């Protein structure tokens, strides 16, 4: 019911590199950030005078 | 005349590391770190047809050499967890004229551990193959009234009346000859029977078919005695040419300084002090040494 405190979300890719110490891989994150639109959440609707 | 699976030898040269002519390289591995002795230096571990070599890889002359007919336990421990990727280790215990050694052999980098595998099964070709290169008697080699032939050997001739100069009344037997060893059984009782190979002879004469051995089965002079000569002269000269054409290439039949004193299994002991009876124990036990006694060994 409530409306979210921002539209923004994010998405976060965790990987790793293959190496010559850790053959495992060393792990390593990187991310991005998406922005959401009002017609998502919104809609129009009557307005007040006060 | 060939000691590199019968003897362990420190610091060797660089020419009796490379590959004999029946030996065969198998399998290698780099940065093979040695322990047991805490040099902290890198190497090459090398499992080879007739016995495993490591050199230091950056200063090649200081190696080892074992041979697979002096190892008793050779053991892989995989351990050193999380903290980095599984490494494994070797342990090999090893007994050369009554002196036990033990190497460890480290795998540094944990990204190519598999060599540890296919050495134990060589080792156990090495030994399910002894007929091959070693001096035997009495063995169970006739089956109900033929040979039971090895798997890389077929037999030449098939020479029957063949008498033995080394016994008395249990001689006339018969005489198989194949590209890799020769043996004769007794044709009565036949469990009087020697089969030599011809990594073990020395030199085929006559005095009589008269063979000696090289000087690791004793000076074991074996002499037989055929029905005229003819087929006698025959067989010595099929004989020697047999002989020479297998010493070209062996075979092997294995199918697929200071330096000593660092690497005891015991601990500053090479030795073995003659084992006497005991009073105490009522067993054979090793001699004590110079006023040791049993109850004072044993309490801590």
Known sequence: ?50 | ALWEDRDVRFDVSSQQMKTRPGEVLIDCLDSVEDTKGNNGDRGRLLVTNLRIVWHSLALPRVNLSIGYNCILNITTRTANSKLRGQTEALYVLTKCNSTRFEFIFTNLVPGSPRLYTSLIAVHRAYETSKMYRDFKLRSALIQNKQLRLLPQENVYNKINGVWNLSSDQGNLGTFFITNVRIVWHANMNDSFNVSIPYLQIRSVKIRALVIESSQQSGGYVLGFKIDPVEKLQESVKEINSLHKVYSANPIFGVDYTDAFVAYFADGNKQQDREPVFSEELGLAIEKLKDGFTLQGLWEV
């Open chain 1, 1 to 50: 019911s409530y409306s979210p405190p921002e539209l923004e979300g994010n998405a976060v890719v965790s990987y790793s590199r293959p190496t010559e110490r850790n053959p495992d891989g060393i792990p390593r994150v990187s991310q991005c950030k998406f922005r959401l639109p009002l017609k998502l959440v919104c809609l129009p609707g009557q307005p007040s005078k006060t």
